[PDB]
């Protein structure tokens, strides 16, 4: 597993959160945390935490 895509839009709740739209693709930098993963947007290059359940592997049915 390497790339993930956002399933739904999301407004950052905190300063270290990312704001992304449906379809936006990511690269996971830290999948250690429970429901919050650190990641980089491949659309903006920005880094930040994202909701674990708002994304799914790009090779998703």
């Amino acid at each position: 597993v390497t790339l993930f895509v956002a399933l739904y839009d999301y407004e950052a709740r905190t300063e270290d959160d990312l704001s992304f739209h449906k379809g936006e693709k990511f690269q996971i930098l830290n999948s250690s945390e429970g429901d919050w993963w650190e990641a980089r947007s491949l659309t903006t290059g920005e880094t930040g935490y994202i909701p674990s359940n708002y994304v799914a592997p790009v090779d998703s049915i």
Binding site: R13, T14, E15, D16, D17, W36, Y49
Partner: protein, 104 residues
């Protein structure tokens, strides 16, 4: 959450003042537990002979925030380590930027 190097846990207010005064440097800082309120923490920074204490706490959603002056917009952070980084920068609203971490 709270596994940062400057977190000292349950140390007394006076113990925190000592550790900071020892460095003799403005901007030296540490993080400890509040002496009487569960779930509340104190960010301590030395500036011109005094230890400035900012109260830090979580919300229901588990986001961290430092006590803000009335009329000023609060800022939230998922990880306490990002709240600290944000305050290492100049003109962020505190007496002096966090500069010398006093690790446990």
């Amino acid at each position: 959450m709270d596994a940062v190097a400057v977190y000292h846990g349950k140390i007394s207010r006076e113990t925190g003042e000592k550790l900071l005064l020892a460095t003799g440097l403005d901007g030296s800082y540490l993080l400890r537990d509040s002496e009487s309120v569960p779930g509340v923490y104190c960010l301590c920074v030395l500036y011109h002979g005094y230890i400035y204490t900012y109260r830090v706490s979580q919300t229901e959603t588990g986001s961290w925030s430092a006590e803000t002056a009335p009329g000023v917009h609060k800022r939230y952070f998922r990880k306490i380590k990002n709240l600290i980084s944000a305050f290492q920068k100049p003109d962020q609203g505190i007496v002096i930027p966090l500069q010398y971490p006093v690790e446990k």
